[PDB]
């Protein structure tokens, strides 16, 4: 994957050029306000160490930091998402993979149509990354899944387990 990251907005100012994860952009750029991504799937993170919001971009370029629905001009890490060939994701009701299961194949709009629940409090994802939306229809705060086990919503660096929505990282 390719990324090219700048400090002002319509890709001026100091530039950056990524081709793998950064845990810290701060040496190399005190902000961010646009973005071409030539390849690859990325996910931006407002804070280092891929914490704080996070947002994520495919290909192609982005003029402003609201083209990829940012809250702030502030991106401090970046990870250049694995590929992935196939997908497959189970959410819980309730932690430690309790109550209810429903398993997940293609991406979900409305997840409380065949989740019928309002939170998810754990997870395994078996294949692929994932991008759970807070609210429906793909809005709200970000979480990258990867693969793994993900036994409450802290593992995804969540405040909450609220989720509306959820896609498949495709590249």
Known sequence: GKITLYEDRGFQGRHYECSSDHTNLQPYLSRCNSARVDS????????????????????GDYADHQQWMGLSDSVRSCRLIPHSGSHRIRLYEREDYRGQMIEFTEDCSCLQDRFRFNEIHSLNVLEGSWVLYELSNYRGRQYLLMPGDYRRYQDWGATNARVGSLRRVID
């Open 40 to 59: 690859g799937c990325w996910m931006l993170y407002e804070q280092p160490n891929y914490s704080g919001l996070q947002y994520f971009l495919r290909r």
